[PDB]
Amino acid sequence: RDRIPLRIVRAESELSPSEKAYLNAVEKGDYASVKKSLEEAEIYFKININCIDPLGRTALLIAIENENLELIELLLSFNVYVGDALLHAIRKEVVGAVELLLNHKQFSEFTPDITPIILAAHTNNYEIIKLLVQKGVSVPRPHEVDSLRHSRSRLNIYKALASPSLIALSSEDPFLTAFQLSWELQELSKVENEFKSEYEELSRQCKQFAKDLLDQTRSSRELEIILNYRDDLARLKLAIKYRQKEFVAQPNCQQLLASRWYDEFPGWRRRHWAVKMVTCFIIGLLFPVFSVCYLIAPKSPLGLFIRKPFIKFICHTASYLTFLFLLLLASQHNRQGPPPTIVEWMILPWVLGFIWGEIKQMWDGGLQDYIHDWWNLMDFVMNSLYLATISLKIVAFVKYSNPRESWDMWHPTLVAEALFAIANIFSSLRLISLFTANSHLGPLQISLGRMLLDILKFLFIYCLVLLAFANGLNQLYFYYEETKGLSCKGIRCEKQNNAFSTLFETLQSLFWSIFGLINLYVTNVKAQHEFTEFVGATMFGTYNVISLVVLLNMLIAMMNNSYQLIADHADIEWKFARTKLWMSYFEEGGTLPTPFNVIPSPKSIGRRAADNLRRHHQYQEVMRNLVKRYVAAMIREAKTEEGLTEENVKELKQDISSFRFEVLGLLR
Amino acid sequence: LQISLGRMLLDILKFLFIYCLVLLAFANGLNQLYFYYEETKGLSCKGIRCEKQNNAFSTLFETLQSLFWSIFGLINLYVTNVKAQHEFTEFVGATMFGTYNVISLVVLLNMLIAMMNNSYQLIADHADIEWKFARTKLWMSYFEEGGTLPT
Amino acid sequence: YQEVMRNLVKRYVAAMIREAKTEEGLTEENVKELKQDISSFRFEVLGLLR
Amino acid sequence: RDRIPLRIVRAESELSPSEKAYLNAVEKGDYASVKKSLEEAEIYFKININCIDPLGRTALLIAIENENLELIELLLSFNVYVGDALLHAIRKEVVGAVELLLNHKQFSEFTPDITPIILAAHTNNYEIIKLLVQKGVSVPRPHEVDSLRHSRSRLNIYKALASPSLIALSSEDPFLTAFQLSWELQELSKVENEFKSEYEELSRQCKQFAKDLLDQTRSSRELEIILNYRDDLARLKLAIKYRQKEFVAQPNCQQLLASRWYDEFPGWRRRHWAVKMVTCFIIGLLFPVFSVCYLIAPKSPLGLFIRKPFIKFICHTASYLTFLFLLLLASQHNRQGPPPTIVEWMILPWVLGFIWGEIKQMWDGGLQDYIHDWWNLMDFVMNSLYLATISLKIVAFVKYSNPRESWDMWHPTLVAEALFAIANIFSSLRLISLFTANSHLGPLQISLGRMLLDILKFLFIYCLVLLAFANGLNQLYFYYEETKGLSCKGIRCEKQNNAFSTLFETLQSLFWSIFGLINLYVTNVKAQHEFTEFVGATMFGTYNVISLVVLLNMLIAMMNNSYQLIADHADIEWKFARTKLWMSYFEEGGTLPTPFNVIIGRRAADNLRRHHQYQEVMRNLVKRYVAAMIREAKTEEGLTEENVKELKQDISSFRFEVLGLLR
Amino acid sequence: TNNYEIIKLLVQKGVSVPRPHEVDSLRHSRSRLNIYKALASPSLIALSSEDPFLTAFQLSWELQELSKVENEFKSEYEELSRQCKQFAKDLLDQTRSSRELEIILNYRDDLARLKLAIKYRQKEFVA
Numbered sequence A: 001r002d003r004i005p006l007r008i009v010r011a012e013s014e015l016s017p018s019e020k021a022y023l024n025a026v027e028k029g030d031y032a033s034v035k036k037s038l039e040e041a042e043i044y045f046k047i048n049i050n051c052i053d054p055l056g057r058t059a060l061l062i063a064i065e066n067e068n069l070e071l072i073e074l075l076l077s078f079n080v081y082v083g084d085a086l087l088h089a090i091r092k093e094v095v096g097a098v099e100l101l102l103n104h105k106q107f108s109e110f111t112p113d114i115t116p117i118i119l120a121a122h123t124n125n126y127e128i129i130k131l132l133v134q135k136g137v138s139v140p141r142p143h144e145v146d147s148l149r150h151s152r153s154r155l156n157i158y159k160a161l162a163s164p165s166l167i168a169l170s171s172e173d174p175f176l177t178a179f180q181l182s183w184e185l186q187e188l189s190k191v192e193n194e195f196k197s198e199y200e201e202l203s204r205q206c207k208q209f210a211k212d213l214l215d216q217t218r219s220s221r222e223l224e225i226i227l228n229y230r231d232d233l234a235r236l237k238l239a240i241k242y243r244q245k246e247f248v249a250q251p252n253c254q255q256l257l258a259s260r261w262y263d264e265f266p267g268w269r270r271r272h273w274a275v276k277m278v279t280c281f282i283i284g285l286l287f288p289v290f291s292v293c294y295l296i297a298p299k300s301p302l303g304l305f306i307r308k309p310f311i312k313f314i315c316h317t318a319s320y321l322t323f324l325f326l327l328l329l330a331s332q333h334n335r336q337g338p339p340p341t342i343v344e345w346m347i348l349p350w351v352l353g354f355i356w357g358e359i360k361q362m363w364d365g366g367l368q369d370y371i372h373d374w375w376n377l378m379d380f381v382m383n384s385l386y387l388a389t390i391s392l393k394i395v396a397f398v399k400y401s402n403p404r405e406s407w408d409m410w411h412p413t414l415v416a417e418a419l420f421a422i423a424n425i426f427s428s429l430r431l432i433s434l435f436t437a438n439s440h441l442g443p444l445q446i447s448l449g450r451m452l453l454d455i456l457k458f459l460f461i462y463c464l465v466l467l468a469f470a471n472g473l474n475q476l477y478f479y480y481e482e483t484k485g486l487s488c489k490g491i492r493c494e495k496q497n498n499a500f501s502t503l504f505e506t507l508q509s510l511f512w513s514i515f516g517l518i519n520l521y522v523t524n525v526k527a528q529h530e531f532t533e534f535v536g537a538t539m540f541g542t543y544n545v546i547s548l549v550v551l552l553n554m555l556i557a558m559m560n561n562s563y564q565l566i567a568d569h570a571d572i573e574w575k576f577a578r579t580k581l582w583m584s585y586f587e588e589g590g591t592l593p594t595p596f597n598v599i600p601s602p603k604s605i606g607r608r609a610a611d612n613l614r615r616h617h618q619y620q621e622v623m624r625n626l627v628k629r630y631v632a633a634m635i636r637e638a639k640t641e642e643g644l645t646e647e648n649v650k651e652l653k654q655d656i657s658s659f660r661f662e663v664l665g666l667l668r
Numbered sequence B: 001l002q003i004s005l006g007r008m009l010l011d012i013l014k015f016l017f018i019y020c021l022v023l024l025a026f027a028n029g030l031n032q033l034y035f036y037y038e039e040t041k042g043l044s045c046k047g048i049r050c051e052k053q054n055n056a057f058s059t060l061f062e063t064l065q066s067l068f069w070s071i072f073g074l075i076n077l078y079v080t081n082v083k084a085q086h087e088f089t090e091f092v093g094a095t096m097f098g099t100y101n102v103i104s105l106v107v108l109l110n111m112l113i114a115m116m117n118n119s120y121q122l123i124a125d126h127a128d129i130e131w132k133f134a135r136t137k138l139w140m141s142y143f144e145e146g147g148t149l150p151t
Numbered sequence C: 001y002q003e004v005m006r007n008l009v010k011r012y013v014a015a016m017i018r019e020a021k022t023e024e025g026l027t028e029e030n031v032k033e034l035k036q037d038i039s040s041f042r043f044e045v046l047g048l049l050r
Numbered sequence D: 001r002d003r004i005p006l007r008i009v010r011a012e013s014e015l016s017p018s019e020k021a022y023l024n025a026v027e028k029g030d031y032a033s034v035k036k037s038l039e040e041a042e043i044y045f046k047i048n049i050n051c052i053d054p055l056g057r058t059a060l061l062i063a064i065e066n067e068n069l070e071l072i073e074l075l076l077s078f079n080v081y082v083g084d085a086l087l088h089a090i091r092k093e094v095v096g097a098v099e100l101l102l103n104h105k106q107f108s109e110f111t112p113d114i115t116p117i118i119l120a121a122h123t124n125n126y127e128i129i130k131l132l133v134q135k136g137v138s139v140p141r142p143h144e145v146d147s148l149r150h151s152r153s154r155l156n157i158y159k160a161l162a163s164p165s166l167i168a169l170s171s172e173d174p175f176l177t178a179f180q181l182s183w184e185l186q187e188l189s190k191v192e193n194e195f196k197s198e199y200e201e202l203s204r205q206c207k208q209f210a211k212d213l214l215d216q217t218r219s220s221r222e223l224e225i226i227l228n229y230r231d232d233l234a235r236l237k238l239a240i241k242y243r244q245k246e247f248v249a250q251p252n253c254q255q256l257l258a259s260r261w262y263d264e265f266p267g268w269r270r271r272h273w274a275v276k277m278v279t280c281f282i283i284g285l286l287f288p289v290f291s292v293c294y295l296i297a298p299k300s301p302l303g304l305f306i307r308k309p310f311i312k313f314i315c316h317t318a319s320y321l322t323f324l325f326l327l328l329l330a331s332q333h334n335r336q337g338p339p340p341t342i343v344e345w346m347i348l349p350w351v352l353g354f355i356w357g358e359i360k361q362m363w364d365g366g367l368q369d370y371i372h373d374w375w376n377l378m379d380f381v382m383n384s385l386y387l388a389t390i391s392l393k394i395v396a397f398v399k400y401s402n403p404r405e406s407w408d409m410w411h412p413t414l415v416a417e418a419l420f421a422i423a424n425i426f427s428s429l430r431l432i433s434l435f436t437a438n439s440h441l442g443p444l445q446i447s448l449g450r451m452l453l454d455i456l457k458f459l460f461i462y463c464l465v466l467l468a469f470a471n472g473l474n475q476l477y478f479y480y481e482e483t484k485g486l487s488c489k490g491i492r493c494e495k496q497n498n499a500f501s502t503l504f505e506t507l508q509s510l511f512w513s514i515f516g517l518i519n520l521y522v523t524n525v526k527a528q529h530e531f532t533e534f535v536g537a538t539m540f541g542t543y544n545v546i547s548l549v550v551l552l553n554m555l556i557a558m559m560n561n562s563y564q565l566i567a568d569h570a571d572i573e574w575k576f577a578r579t580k581l582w583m584s585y586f587e588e589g590g591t592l593p594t595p596f597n598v599i600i601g602r603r604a605a606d607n608l609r610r611h612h613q614y615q616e617v618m619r620n621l622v623k624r625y626v627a628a629m630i631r632e633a634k635t636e637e638g639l640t641e642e643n644v645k646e647l648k649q650d651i652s653s654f655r656f657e658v659l660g661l662l663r
Numbered sequence E: 001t002n003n004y005e006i007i008k009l010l011v012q013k014g015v016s017v018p019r020p021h022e023v024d025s026l027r028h029s030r031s032r033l034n035i036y037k038a039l040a041s042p043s044l045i046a047l048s049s050e051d052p053f054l055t056a057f058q059l060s061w062e063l064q065e066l067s068k069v070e071n072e073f074k075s076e077y078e079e080l081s082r083q084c085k086q087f088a089k090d091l092l093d094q095t096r097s098s099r100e101l102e103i104i105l106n107y108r109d110d111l112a113r114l115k116l117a118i119k120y121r122q123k124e125f126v127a
């Protein structure tokens, strides 16, 4: 028509105008008119007590929303249907919920999984949670042997258990509850792609709660009581095990790890940086001097001097540097390859030292925690190529005796030299992993290492573009141009005669055509077919546009967004890996670096219950202090939020209005 | 503008030490693989800079020049041949040179672009107040007497 | 110089105490102040009328 | 020592504890204890009335800060030294300043340039400004024939004049006041390096005020009364003249300009885009048909057809496209050259049309507004190369008669062909300036054009790096090499024989070595000097690192920050240039594109009628605007603490009055 | 808390602060950071300082070079040094009249206060 008719499609019963006067009496703060209207309401005919608006509000709630406790005492003095009014008393953090605890299909606003203590934990109010635990309320355990209720109810249970007040109260130790809950919520967010950000939010909440308990640690003996609690530094090991990147790199914790890392050094971190370079240089030069000791006399000044973990790092990395200067020296110095040089004879204790060090590293931690870090996998590939290299040198020495250059092209000396060179690339890229100790080159290296996983998602797409244009240029050019009468037959050849002939040759031609290293005369046919040459050069041109312009600048943009997202969490991430580095040098069994790891390098009971009860009650005493001052601290921080909702004005408004209705009731 | 670039230089110089260790890495590899495989001293010109590029991976210093100039498009593929017939060492050497070009030109250099995107975003907030500090360091070196009558 | 700094510290302290007022954010404890400024007045007037 | 002592270094007098009881009688709202203590204060024994805290807090101010008007009436009933208390009544927007207006070296908190109406304009409260204009208060004019007071006082005067309530009140028309003040504050921010962001902030305030008056225009006849007010569309021409990029691209004004741009197309902007391409294609094909008319009969359907400005754009740009397809056709077709082909005989009316069009464009607007836009300068260079081309063709035809290739190397046919080709590059890059009409290719082109000025600041640094490494590589390679036997002698040759020989050759070698186009055998010496070859290749290497690894990625980062700063304002600043494109086709005298370009008391009655009509419309807009901003002052989603300081005394004074009536 | 009135109420009774330098470990660095956090407030420097520009400059220098010493608590001492560097600019902002500004920027205990400001890297005092 010309107009639209607006009618209430979903009908509401509404209420008798006398009932509207009763709900006008309440919420205005009338202690007189509500009492008069309820005494009238005893007579059944005039009005009903449990009257409900078309918009919620069944009488009792209005006395909670407009926070007035005398009307709650008046309505609970009568028989008002409570229903879910206790839960509405929990949301607003009204501590008049005592009056709903101590005393006394209908459109419940809440999902029916909600018990009072679940919604008490969601509001994170310490007082109401203490008021509900004192009566005794349980939570269901989450594990299982129609579908929205199950995942919603499990997320409400984990959302309730992850609150820092059912972990401050009702936990034997809140650090294990925060750590194990952060683990179960993280690994639970990986299970369900749906509800991913909510379980990640809860795991971030548990990871922040533990740092906010560390922040309350004064008097550093308490910090050692926390970080030594074995049910060494067992708590830190268990914190690094659960990836608690904010528990570690608390500034209190790094004081403990930094002093532990600097045993006898005095004000080492106060000296000049060039003096630090001189001390690290001359300690790095004397690494066989300190490590011949601890084999002669481990109870000695030099034997106790390498037991200090900052000196273990300079001895371990200094030994590794001399291994690398010796590999620099290897290339500056017969098919029957024997001891080719004195260099290799010097190399074998270092290589057996790294193989022993990686097997010894795999004897503790397991292949899961070993295979989690990428540098250990790089050590596996490196040392595997060292075993292949020395095995092909031995096998090359036996059963071979002498053409100069002519050889089998799979002669094991050549494969030994090639795998040796690849193992030198992988061996001398380990110095990058030495950057996490430095404070300037540290966070940079870990930000790049964090962008690598976003690059490797991108190169898949590029590999499918390579398979695409490789199929296309091979298919078009394996008939038209083929040369078998040529001398050098590859892209490498100075002439570049065949590029797209075969598929592997085409993959090399496109991969090298990322760079400016393959010329156009590549795409010419020895015959005279200008159509297939033009189609092939257009094929190669759109490859260069999609790869060089379309995708590589998308990779730049992707690393711009990823590096923006990384550098926020760079400092707290760097220090977690710096502790991982530091805390691998605290333990004994791990001193005496690689050439001295196995041999000197060749010239070529009621007291258990007493300590458990001692340490247990001591730790629970410290926890009692930390949970006390923590709950006081967060309650303090609840007050300061710099924002006032509209229901605070709703509280002041009735504070004035009920006082008006009472003074005017006493004056008239 | 000049002071924002001067501000980004200290973040570049932290970056080039990583690249120097990558140069040390692939230089150790390509020297170690190509010092025996090929040599040939019967050349009129004998380096990368020559018109034919005869020996590039032969010496460590020659390999450092070959990788550094292979950042740019200035070193051709026929560099990685062997005068003898060893297709395996030529392929492993060209794969090592290829992963050098991927790590240096595709991953390392665009990470440097991203790093200068974040650093230049962090600098240009405090650009106006830090330009004028250096402008008064320039101005206030001309207020005193004893420094007039130029060079 | 101490007279000039007397003037600057005077008008500076006045300026920052002026800027403490205009923060565009009220914490909840301000409502905790107004609520007791009504509540004590309630329990005093009701103490004088009863 | 072991401690550090803390003493009050800047000591002041401490008020007598009775005076502390008097200043504790105020700040609580006592209407009884203040009155008793002041009646006691008439006796000079116990308390002086004008008592001052060590922290401001004069007795009167506390009654203003804690906003209580009855204590202001009580203190002004007595003789309290007011001083600067009126100004403190202005800051808090207390409308009890009436009581300080109608009635009645000391540490003034304010700079002594501050009159009441300047600080009334800084607070932007309409009511207090109306209360001070009704008494009659003037502002000093800013112009001049010890130094902080002068620039601070001028910035307070311009800060007061730029407020949208001394422009809503006290201005004959607030659009000229907003436009001219935005101009004077922008061009005043360019004068003073210091205080740049503050005058730019005030000019942005004036530029927002005008758009916020156009937002109050309902009933589109009012919008035409505003946008036609000549003291055509004179107010939009004057708005584009003052770079009011937010006045233009209000959504109300772009409907007037869009409907003006579409005269007799009923709902053109609703059709399918391919149908739009067909209509623009066949109107673009019939350009000579519509433009032979308006020469035959300008009072005719086809003569009035080309007077519509959307059809002028398709005829002008379609004619320009056929000029460019004809330049494509020129290269697909004797020292003493003629007008050699039929092509250039066809070209000459096109070229004389553009020269006439640019001289005709320079007859109106002046060389300042003409030289402000860059495409007009590009037209100047293009048509200058056209004059040089045809002049060297005519000069080449006379006094020359025939070696086919062996020529002078400066022979005017070659210079004519080279300048003709450069003029074709410049001529066929004008199609990019056709992008502002399109809604998808529009804001992109203007964002790139706004990054160009940030690129050109960067290339001067790069030119100094070129002079640096060019001085080095020339200085090192001038001696060691100079192959003067080679058949081909430069970088462009097949062998690249001498590249760092001379300075110009070195500049070409480094510039082309930005790209991968110069090999390494360039840096050899014909002699055997490995040290100078290595130092030269290290200099060339550090040139490649500074230019390609540091300098060019810094340019990428710079364009990342600049493009982030541009794309916030990209859409509004696109539409300003789109109305600069649109509004150049509204006027007559400018039709008939390039090849067809050449070949009395009633005045006072209309001035009073338009003047009183426009003042009535502005009466309505200022009324509903002031109502709109006073509505928006209420909703700010933030309460300062002094609101709680108002409610707390509104309870406290009521307490000390009820307790005064019951006891 | 940076409240001027309560600080004036406590200085009038006479209260001292320990000096930070010395010849179990959380109390020492936490107590040191509370002492420097208290001395860096712009009301102990408005009161209880002979001249607050030298106190702001020298405290910004000791808090910056103290943040370089301790890698832990780095952002907190940098925050306090930024607070001291903002305080000096917020005292310049209160300079009305050219003559006063020259009294400040000529105070040798030339332009000695500008030279001493550039010496302490006060990039917001300058500009």
Ligand SMILES: CCCCCCCCCCCCCCCC(=O)OC[C@H](COP(=O)(O)O)OC(=O)CCCCCCCCCCCCCCC
Residues within 6 Å of the ligand: A534, A536, A537, A538, A539, A540, A541, A542, A543, A545, A546, A549, A550
């Ligand atoms: C598809 C999944 C991957 C992501 C999607 C990619 C988006 C689609 C890519 C578009 C296809 C590439 C264009 C066609 C290639 C081509 O023409 O290459 C084919 C040939 C190139 O020369 P040949 O003909 O000799 O091969 O084109 C020509 O004949 C010459 C004229 C064409 C000019 C090309 C204009 C396109 C602009 C591309 C360069 C942009 C540079 C950016 C810097 C300003």
Ligand SMILES: CCCCCCCCCCCCCCCC(=O)OC[C@H](COP(=O)(O)O)OC(=O)CCCCCCCCCCCCCCC
Residues within 6 Å of the ligand: A429, A452, A459, A462, A463, A466, A507, A508, A511, A512, A514, A547, A548, A551, A552, B091, B093, B094, B095, B096, B098, B099, B102, B103, B106, B107, B108
């Ligand atoms: C390690 C510390 C530094 C940072 C970490 C770097 C991350 C790991 C880098 C991955 C290794 C590089 C890939 C291997 C190189 C290689 O294959 O090079 C080795 C050869 C290249 O040709 P040759 O065999 O002739 O040498 O590979 C081939 O045989 C041809 C088929 C392989 C195709 C490569 C596909 C990988 C994609 C890389 C290009 C991406 C371009 C991006 C634009 C879209």
Ligand SMILES: CCCCCCCCCCCCCCCC(=O)OC[C@H](COP(=O)(O)O)OC(=O)CCCCCCCCCCCCCCC
Residues within 6 Å of the ligand: B009, B016, B019, B020, B023, B064, B065, B068, B069, B071, B104, B105, B108, B109, B112, D534, D536, D537, D538, D539, D541, D542, D545, D546, D549, D550
């Ligand atoms: C100065 C104002 C401009 C801005 C300031 C620029 C910052 C300073 C620039 C540093 C100087 C450049 C380095 C020296 C050039 C050079 O060595 O070039 C000189 C030569 C290059 O080969 P030649 O010796 O044959 O010339 O160096 C060598 O001999 C080979 C070994 C050096 C390896 C260079 C390692 C530096 C890393 C630079 C590449 C980074 C690539 C980034 C992608 C990962």
Ligand SMILES: CC(C)CCC[C@@H](C)[C@H]1CC[C@H]2[C@@H]3CC=C4C[C@@H](OC(=O)CCC(=O)O)CC[C@]4(C)[C@H]3CC[C@]12C
Residues within 6 Å of the ligand: A317, A321, A322, A324, A325, A328, A431, A434, A435, A437, A438, A439, B021, B024
């Ligand atoms: C080929 C060999 C002979 C040398 C190749 C490596 C060296 C040239 C450089 C490259 C990386 C540098 C390393 C990078 C990082 C560190 C960590 C850094 O250790 C610290 O920061 C000390 C701990 C602290 O700072 O508290 C100083 C030494 C070291 C190993 C550097 C030692 C010198 C290295 C190995």
Ligand SMILES: CC(C)CCC[C@@H](C)[C@H]1CC[C@H]2[C@@H]3CC=C4C[C@@H](OC(=O)CCC(=O)O)CC[C@]4(C)[C@H]3CC[C@]12C
Residues within 6 Å of the ligand: D280, D317, D321, D431, D434, D435, D437, D438, D439
């Ligand atoms: C793709 C390469 C080969 C360039 C093609 C040459 C021309 C045919 C193209 C280049 C730019 C195009 C122009 C770019 C922008 C416009 C504006 C546009 O005009 C409008 O938007 C109509 C007004 C409106 O949309 O309200 C449509 C035509 C036109 C001139 C285009 C016409 C066709 C042009 C001249």
Ligand code: NA
Residues within 6 Å of the ligand: A358, A361, A375, A376, A379
């Ligand atoms: Na390992």
Ligand code: NA
Residues within 6 Å of the ligand: D357, D358, D361, D375, D376, D379
């Ligand atoms: Na023009």
